[PDB]
Nucleic acid binder design. Structure first.
Ligand SMILES: Cc1ccnc2c1NC(=O)c1cccnc1N2C1CC1
Lengths: 555, 412
DNA sequence: CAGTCCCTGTTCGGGCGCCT
DNA sequence: AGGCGCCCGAACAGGGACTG
């Protein structure tokens, strides 16, 4: 008989399946001498058993290495067992952001030892465990066994650990409502607003409640070690920061250099305000090999520079104070780049960030701003569970003019103006009504699908005509192309009649930038006009001077 | 100690594995305080990592209510229990429900907590209550009783419902009673005073049969359909005639007898948009003849039970929104318009949410079915905010649309 | 009809960043 | 091996207008 520590979790197998039988796979010859013995250790501790007849089960070995160890860490490969094992609801839904933590006077870290082996495996599932690995080189064929606990590298380990741990801590927490625990893997972080000494009272008193379940908490735990280093972070009860970032100064630039580069900058953006990655990410466009050679452009270097001076001096984030309001303020950095700071007390930031993403073929600043605000709200809910009050570089009339006109439902939550140029503006507006005494250009274009050849042109009420031949084009491009002509050849006020639903759709959303140089050009002319009224009629209905410019280009 | 109706996921498909979306601390508090009570009452109970299923959950306040209601998004589950409800047990849809001068909607969902649930099915009701900033992991439960908002729940409790109501139906044979999920639709041609009284009367019955019930009225006899209409003009510009012909050309997908021929000829040369052109009689007669075909019905438009409903919404500006419910393009079972809904002139998303709820409602009262929406909104925008404006116990199906305005012509 | 194209938006898959 | 983020490209859906 062995004995029975802590409540057990039912485990099935993917219905209509059973345990694996496998051939061995290579592992280093030196370290493999250590385990021949180690199995004999566990027998006595309750971690192992064996049977001769009952196991048609065999498993190989493939492992992963960790830096900063004074001793070597073992692994076993269940990959065959895994695929044959039931799925679990994963316990890790992601990780807390330092910036979401409340300030705690006292913060300690207990590390659970023999964490995975401290948890009883399901009685009835134990069997599927049998395994074999090379002796030293080898002599005799081998031997085998079964697991009484959670095996390293099994699909179900992290999930079942996490739930048991949670289950244990639960009764403690209810008896200590104002302590605060967090579990990441096998480590617990505890914190309180009690006095520095009386806090350590509860730290041992908790080491008690964990022991009562067979969970060992050594004294390597450090109250005097904090800052604690956790997943790239440095944490003091009062303030947090990213762990120090080393930006390559390398003269040699490989597309893989710029990559590692960008990723670090992007990681820097949660804290150091104003990082821009735009031009460096452009280098990466359409390259075949990750080992390829690339030169740095002036913009990308002018950017890389500005970023380096930001990292020069250090910076730190504060923590969250539920009593005080949340504030998110956004600045336009140009080239469709955006930055934001989220703070409570002025000039002390909880966190920062960028929004650079250019979404759609043709867009404008209002849209891109609306998008950043949505990014920020989403992030804010995850982290603080509430929406920040927004400080935005946009006139309340600018915004009102946009959203009430746009065809889509669009919204920004409660927000106020911050006059911090560049301000967000609408660069032109289309008239809602025909412009009296403006020339009226009827425009059309056509191209031939086969020859990619076509023509773009117009007719006006004044008798003015134009037709321009075009090479290597499409039906759409010519319709854009005709509107372009009509803008160029018209005075400061003009009415344009187009039958292109495609074209009308782009222009009407009042784009300020485009992937497309032709649309960009339409935009530049549009910004120069005083008044532009743009109308649509159905094609081939024998309408207006639409039938006429249709003949001209269909010719 | 009573029976339990076994239930099964229709062939081939698994339990819902859908991820939980972030909640506000507000809503996270309300769920914790709501679930602990439902645990104490043994309605739900904690579950382990051995159960790999999840349905999303959130909370809402019903219109004019300061109390938090728990809400599960069972859409994914409901899709995978479906053959069970539709093919197995039918609910006759009163064609009269829509004609009643008044219809009140009562929340009977509470009744469902009585019946036990097939122990084999319970693993599919799994839902996580999330933590702010991921500080604790999720509190995961599963349903012991019949979960509110699941499609089997109103089904299995069907017998029991039909029973408790039979006393009332007999004394009031002229009152119409429909049931869609957690909701009970009750309507009558009675004057509102005695209506509100007859509803309380209905409230007591379920009150004495072991149910609780937290105006609600709709007025279906008054529901209007929004027709297409051509403007009335004294004098017509080229531009007017142009917008007219184009609109008429569109409308003619719906009504084949529309003609633009004579109105078209009016536009012949290349003329200034703002130039004023007089209307010929041959066109004048064509325009007047069209206005006629637009007062008619549409040949061959009728609801087909087997096909799904589809609803389209356009934002018209200045608080107006237009919609059309149809099963096949250009054949509309209904067209309508909404205005000055909450949020008008301030929040678009609030207004669209309001719209989707009013549309879904009429859709249930009329065909006893919720429509699939095409929403004039960005996916992320809608998803980020809709949960704030949601006052209903069901959740229609939706997809996101970008349709710059030439269909904006369901309203001037 | 189709069947084709042209264009645009979304969604997925890969490379880094941070980590197990 | 997977989680969360970014930027990029290539794939895939689907909506109109032209080919006939
Ligand atoms: C790494 C980590 C993750 C999640 N929470 C915490 C921590 N560790 C802390 O450094 C911490 C710091 C300040 C406040 N809470 C903290 N805690 C909470 C437990 C008191």
């Amino acid at each position: 008989v062995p004995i029975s520590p802590i409540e057990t979790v039912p485990v099935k197998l993917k219905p209509g399946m059973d345990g694996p039988k496998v051939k061995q796979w290579p592992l280093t010859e030196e370290k493999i001498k250590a385990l021949v013995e180690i199995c004999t250790e566990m027998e006595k501790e309750g971690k192992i058993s064996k049977i001769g007849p009952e196991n048609p089960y065999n498993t190989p070995v493939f492992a992963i290495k960790k830096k900063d160890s004074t001793k070597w860490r073992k692994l076993v490969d269940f990959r065959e067992l895994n695929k044959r094992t039931q799925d679990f609801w994963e316990v890790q839904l992601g990780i807390p952001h330092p910036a979401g933590l409340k300030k705690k006077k006292s913060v300690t870290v207990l590390d659970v030892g023999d964490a995975y082996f401290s948890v009883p495996l399901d009685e009835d599932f134990r069997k599927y465990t049998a395994f074999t690995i090379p002796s030293i080189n080898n002599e005799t064929p081998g031997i085998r066994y079964q697991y009484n606990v959670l095996p390293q590298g099994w699909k179900g380990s992290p999930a079942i650990f996490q739930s048991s741990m949670t289950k244990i801590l639960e009764p403690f927490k209810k008896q200590n409502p104002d302590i605060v625990i967090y579990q990441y893997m096998d480590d617990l972080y505890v914190g309180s607003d009690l006095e520095i000494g009386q806090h350590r009272t509860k730290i041992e008193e908790l080491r008690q409640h964990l022991l009562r379940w067979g969970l060992t908490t050594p004294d390597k735990k450090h109250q005097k070690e904090p800052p604690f280093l956790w997943m790239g972070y440095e944490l003091h009860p009062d303030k947090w920061t990213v762990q120090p970032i080393v930006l390559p100064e390398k003269d040699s630039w490989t597309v893989n250099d710029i990559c590692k580069l960008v990723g670090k900058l992007n990681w820097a953006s949660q804290i150091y305000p104003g990082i821009k990655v735009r031009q460096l990410s452009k280098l990466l466009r359409g390259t075949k090999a990750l080992t390829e050679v690339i030169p740095l452009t002036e913009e990308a270097e002018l950017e890389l520079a500005e970023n380096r001076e930001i990292l020069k001096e250090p910076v730190h984030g504060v923590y969250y104070d539920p009593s005080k309001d949340l504030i998110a303020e956004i600045q336009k950095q140009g080239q469709g780049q955006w930055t934001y700071q989220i703070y409570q007390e002025p000039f002390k930031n909880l966190k920062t960030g960028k929004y650079a993403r250019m979404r759609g073929a043709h867009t404008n600043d209002v849209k891109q701003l609306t998008e950043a605000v949505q990014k920020i709200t989403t992030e804010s809910i995850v982290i603080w569970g509430k929406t920040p009050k927004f400080k935005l570089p946009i006139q309340k009339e600018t915004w009102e003019t946009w959203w009430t006109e746009y065809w889509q439902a669009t919204w920004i939550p409660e927000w106020e103006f911050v006059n911090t140029p560049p301000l967000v503006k609408l660069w032109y507006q289309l008239e809602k009504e025909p412009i009296v005494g403006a020339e009226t250009f009827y425009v059309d274009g056509a191209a031939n699908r086969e020859t990619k050849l076509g023509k773009a042109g117009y007719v006006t009420n004044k008798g003015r005509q134009k037709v321009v031949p075009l090479t290597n084009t499409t039906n759409q491009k010519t319709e854009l192309q005709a509107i372009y002509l009509a803008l160029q050849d018209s005075g400061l006020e003009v009415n344009i009649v187009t039958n292109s639903q495609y074209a009308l759709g782009i222009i009407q959303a009042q784009p300020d930038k485009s992937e497309s140089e032709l649309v960009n050009q339409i935009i530049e002319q549009l910004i120069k006009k005083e008044k532009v009224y743009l109308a649509w009629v159905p094609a081939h209905k024998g309408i207006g001077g639409n039938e006429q410019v249709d003949k001209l280009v269909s010719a | 100690p009573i029976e339990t109706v076994p239930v099964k996921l229709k062939p081939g498909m698994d339990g819902p594995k859908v991820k939980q979306w972030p909640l506000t601390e507000e809503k996270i508090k309300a769920l914790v305080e709501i679930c602990t009570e439902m645990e104490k009452e043994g309605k739900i109970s904690k579950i382990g990592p051995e159960n790999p299923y999840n349905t999303p959950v959130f909370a809402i306040k019903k219109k004019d209510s300061t109390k938090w209601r728990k809400l599960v998004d069972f859409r994914e589950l409901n899709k995978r229990t479906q053959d069970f409800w539709e093919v197995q047990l039918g609910i006759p849809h009163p064609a009269g429900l829509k004609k009643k001068k008044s219809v009140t909607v009562l929340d009977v969902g509470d009744a469902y907590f009585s019946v036990p649930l097939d122990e084999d099915f319970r693993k599919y009701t799994a839902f996580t209550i999330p933590s702010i900033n991921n500080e604790t992991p999720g509190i995961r439960y599963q349903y012991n009783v019949l979960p509110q908002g699941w499609k089997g729940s109103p089904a299995i409790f069907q017998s029991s419902m039909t029973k408790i109501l039979e006393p009332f139906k007999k004394q009031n044979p002229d009152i119409v009673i429909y049931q869609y999920m957690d909701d009970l639709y009750v309507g009558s041609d009675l004057e509102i005073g005695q209506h509100r009284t007859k509803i309380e009367e209905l409230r007591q019955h379920l009150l004495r049969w072991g149910l609780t019930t937290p105006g609600y009225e709709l007025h279906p006899d008054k529901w209007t359909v929004q027709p297409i209409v051509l403007p009335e003009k004294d004098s017509w510009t080229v531009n007017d005639i142009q917008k007219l012909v184009g609109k008429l050309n569109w409308a003619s997908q719906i009504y084949p007898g529309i003609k633009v021929r004579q109105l078209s000829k009016l536009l012949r040369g290349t003329k200034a948009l703002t130039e004023v052109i007089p209307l010929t009689e041959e066109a004048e007669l064509e325009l007047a003849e069209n206005r006629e075909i637009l007062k008619e019905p549409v040949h061959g438009v009728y609801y087909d039970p087997s096909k799904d409903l589809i609803a389209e919404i356009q934002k018209q500006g200045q608080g107006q929104w237009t919609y059309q419910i149809y099963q096949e393009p250009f054949k509309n079972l209904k067209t309508g318009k909404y205005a000055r809904m909450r949020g008008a002139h301030t929040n678009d998303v609030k207004q669209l949410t309001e719209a989707v709820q009013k549309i879904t409602t009429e859709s249930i009262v009329i065909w006893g079915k919720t429509p699939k929406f095409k929403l004039p909104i960005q996916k992320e925008t809608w998803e980020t905010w809709w949960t704030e404006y949601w006052q209903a116990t069901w959740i229609p199906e939706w997809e996101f649309v970008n349709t710059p305005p030439l269909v904006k012509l369901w309203y001037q």
